[PDB]
Amino acid sequence: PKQTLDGNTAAAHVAYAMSEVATIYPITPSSPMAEIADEWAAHGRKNIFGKTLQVAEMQSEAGAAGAVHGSLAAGALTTTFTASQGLLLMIPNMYKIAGELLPCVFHVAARALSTHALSIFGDHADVMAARQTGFAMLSSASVQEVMDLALVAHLATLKARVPFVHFFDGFRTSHEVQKIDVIEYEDMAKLVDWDAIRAFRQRALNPEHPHQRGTAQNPDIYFQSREAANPYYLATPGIVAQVMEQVAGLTGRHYHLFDYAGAPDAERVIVSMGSSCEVIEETVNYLVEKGEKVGLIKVRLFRPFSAEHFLKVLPASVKRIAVLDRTKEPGSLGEPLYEDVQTVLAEHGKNILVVGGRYGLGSKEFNPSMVKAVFDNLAATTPKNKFTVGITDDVTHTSLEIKEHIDTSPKGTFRCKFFGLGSDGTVGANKNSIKIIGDHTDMYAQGYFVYDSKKSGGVTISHLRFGKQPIQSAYLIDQADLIACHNPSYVGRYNLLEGIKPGGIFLLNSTWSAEEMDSRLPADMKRTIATKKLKFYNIDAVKIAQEIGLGSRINVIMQTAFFKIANVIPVDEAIKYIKDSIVKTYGKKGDKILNMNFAAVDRALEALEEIKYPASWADAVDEAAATVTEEPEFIQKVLRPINALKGDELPVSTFTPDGVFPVGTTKYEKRGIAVNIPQWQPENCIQCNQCSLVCPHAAIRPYLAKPADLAGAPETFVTKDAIGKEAAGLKFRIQVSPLDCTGCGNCADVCPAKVKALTMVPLEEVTAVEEANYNFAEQLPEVKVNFNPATVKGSQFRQPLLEFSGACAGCGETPYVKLVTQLFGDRMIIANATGCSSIWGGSAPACPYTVNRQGHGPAWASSLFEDNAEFGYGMALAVAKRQDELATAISKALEAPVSAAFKAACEGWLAGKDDADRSREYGDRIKALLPGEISQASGEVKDLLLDIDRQKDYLTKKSIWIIGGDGWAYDIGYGGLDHVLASGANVNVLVLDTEVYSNTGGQSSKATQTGAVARFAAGGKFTKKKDLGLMAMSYGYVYVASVAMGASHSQLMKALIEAEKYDGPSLIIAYAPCINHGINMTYSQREAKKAVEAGYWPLYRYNPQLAQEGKNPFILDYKTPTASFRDFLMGEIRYTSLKEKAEQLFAKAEADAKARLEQYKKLAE
Amino acid sequence: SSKATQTGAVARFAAGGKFTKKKDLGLMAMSYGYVYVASVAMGASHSQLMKALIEAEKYDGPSLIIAYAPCINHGINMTYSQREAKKAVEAGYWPLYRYNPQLAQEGKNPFILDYKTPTASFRDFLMGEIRYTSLKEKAEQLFAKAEADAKARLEQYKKLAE
């Protein structure tokens, strides 16, 4: 049958049928494969063995690989899904699985490796790093090929005993939705070699016929024993060929080890692998029809590389070959596939000029215009070798010139682009539209979706194609027949109408009438609309959703408008499929919600109005651009073009060679995505600064100013007298940043005043006013205040050094980290684990960490997911070494002819170099005397002072902070975190516990509580939450504290300050509410208060320093809970979706909270 | 050196002796509550080892057995290898306990301390193995911390048994 799937689902479909066990661990973009396999097991889908697949989630990809090996050695057919850094951790086990000849299939959504920077996007870097493990490697070029070749891999591995890596391009294929022929499980089982499966069972470890495997061998037999597996590899190519013939007879689709396409007398041939083959074949068809003698060799079975099967498909007329590799091996003579082609042709004396290139690293676009550029390079007198395609390399001059733009799309293919907002329903609707057309027409359908790094309010661009011929266009849409914009704010911001065909369709969602079109649309846009004679349609979907009662959901409304004008299918048939899909989507909803979505379809059809524009629009002239502000070179040359969706145009000379970026760049974004912003009521405000404390984006802060500094203030900058003996004679004001606020509503909820001093007002009504207010507050001079930073009110007067990140609205993680920068940000270094905290904390080109007026701020670095603790541990050793080098140079200065005041500060620094305040005090004393002391010296004395001046950046003691998520701390990095805590080094570990893998969509973890439902835990987690804090207490010298900002502000302040001052390891586990819980982010702070008050989350502090003072180290900060336990669980969707078996799990959760509280009461006694 | 190496023991990668104390693997495994944990030493009690092995296999769940294994790297006469394990337990150097999760389901305390009162001298045991005598100024400072930590660990296991 025909279904619309993506590469991930197509792979999991085959993997589920052929496997008994599947040990998995989540990593983008391979995690959808394991997610859908777990759901099928939860609903009881049977494999070819009549059982449900057993899915086991491990602590890391290393643990998964070991489990695969053990499951295979004990007699169970097992598979797994991984990619990129996860595949690297499996490489050691892959050598064993290949060495022991165990049948196995790894499904890999090939993704770039983290080098100078992280990239979750697709290339072959990960697969190439395992090409020497002895695994076979099979490449799929399309979603249909993922379906077919996954079956080829699972069938061949049983026959050959050689394990297979079946890999496909990350995102470009794993997330591309296509209508494909799906193979039925019953048809697969008729092709399985059951004799081979039974033979695999006999090789299993069993006490009734025991054997020994994995021995240790001396030099006398090791070489021979390694060569004893040679026959199995020699026969593997022929086995895959015969298996490919089996699939061919079943499906009719013919695969070979290497496939050829193009002119039979071709002289220029490209050899490639993966999704690029689709783009190349599409281009080859276009060029061959135009008479060019070109061809393409698709590599399916990369390892073992069969010279016989490659030369069999190489036409004898080939004179020049260009090999394209989707990876980069720096310093290597060539990339892997290029070296193989060059080798095999040399071994057979073929006089063929071979040239290699690189393309598509990290999902770089690779379109037919580039393919012709590769072909044109073969036609030059001297073809450029070791080239790149898709970039402008103006440094090393390896890039090929994209001369002209060609359109190789087959005639009759429809092409659409959809500009949407984050989570507004656009992407989901397009997925539904593809399923509609694919299920009800003979047309092939394709969908690809471009997402943003910003988690909320980001831009999404959908690329859809439909045609009567198979869709090989594995690239973004170049010439669109229809363009839809679901957010009027994009009008004038992005080049929406780029490349639209003459006479195409432009669909806009806006409240603007035909007359307002003259004043609202920019001149360049009006010129394109008129010159290209576009059919311009408009619809006020927001007005419709308000009148119907759907709120602001416009997904159904805009989808109806699309089918009405696209003319892809009969309009009447489209309306039926939409309403039929509405029943499938809103059938479980109430009867009132069902008829509302029906009214959306009906009202949308009558509200869609075509805009008849005057022909004079073609002559419209742009308005005079304002005087541009002098921005930094990085902002002007890098950040602006990237945010303008033009980053692909930046040449190589734009970037640093080591992936280093400046700090404090998010303050230049000013996205202004909030629907509502807080308005401050000066008369109700008690000056508590809690609103600045809980803001997940630092968009609201208190400002102090002497009355003289308020001279040129606007009339709306209303202030009040400052409360407190420290701020006597000063003015006070709580000011919000309108363009940086997210509209989450946490600050309005936390305001404890009698009358609410913060009320959510719409942005557009107060945007002009609040902009001038914030611009004035930012230009206020620094104000020296003596408020105690240990209090909540006093701490918020310090400048936040973490601002305007890409975290979601109301995120529960960023308020913790923001507070740390306000206390110790002047002198801290951050080692941040991979995860959400690294995504909003370090996504190029914007950096949310900033500096104060002196230019000092946190230095931020992220290594890998599993090594974050040891990453920061190494930093501590180096910083200690850098302070040791300085202390040696200062001690030599004591014996030098220097000022007596200089010696006093130097001796004072040496005595207190390990104290934060004393080192800053005497360190700043040394800094003040340095410029004059150098001027008064000469000769060797000047050189001794110049060496101290070179190291003055290490006078102030540093504070190492290791920040990471619960998935890092509880699972993959726990072994490393355990080691760093036991060492006793002066490090501070901050665990942002969201109880899930938040970034990758919310998968199960050891931090997940009993009964909680998340991805990889469809039926709920049975085992209880692992107590990380209890294990760290077993050392006795590790400071452990459990905090929750929403529950107690004072308890969080005490634990953080005690943890930082403790000369030893400190562990802070903070509860961070997240959108993956399924709650209203408006009450994120309130949800943390209910969690502690109901006994769900404990608050304690384990102070080893109290043990040295003869006191009890364990202090329970909240002993008696007052709220109901079951009532807190029912307030979050992550527990209500389980409801049945839920009542059995809820009882275990309540009993564990009483036993955990009773366990803490015994330790406190 | 390992995390299992005790305080003051001299081994490769620990020329000056290991400062941090031995990681308590059994204590962390008991935090789950459903993991069977037992600490045994054959030279000390033949009957105690028999009970832990049979209880561990029959337990329908995870079991962790930490067994003291004398080694030539300790620097002892291997003729008294069994005797060295007896002297280790009798001096409070190695604990003998059994944490049975099945006892928790029966309303009883899961932790059973199999050796409550040590009878041998703790400092005297260290001088009988080469891996501790090779440190010999600062060595006497490390032995006092090791002996104080061993007494605090025994008082902790007596509190867990109640």
Ligand SMILES: CC(=O)c1sc(CCOP(=O)(O)OP(=O)(O)O)c(C)[n+]1Cc1cnc(C)nc1N
């Ligand atoms: C970014 C990326 O590739 C992420 S973020 C993440 C889990 C984050 O969950 P955590 O609880 O630790 O933090 P949180 O997001 O704040 O909830 C994974 C598994 N990955 C994939 C992954 C897998 N394995 C390895 C070695 N590296 C990475 N980056």
Ligand code: SF4
């Ligand atoms: S509404 Fe949310 S983002 Fe806006 S200022 Fe308040 S807390 Fe910050």
Ligand code: SF4
């Ligand atoms: S939370 Fe309310 S009372 Fe407190 S500073 Fe903010 S606006 Fe004023």
Ligand code: SF4
């Ligand atoms: S932790 Fe949750 S709320 Fe915060 S940015 Fe990540 S997904 Fe969004």
Ligand code: SF4
């Ligand atoms: S005594 Fe010998 S065999 Fe036994 S653990 Fe020590 S080195 Fe290994």
Ligand SMILES: [Mg+2]
């Ligand atoms: Mg998390």
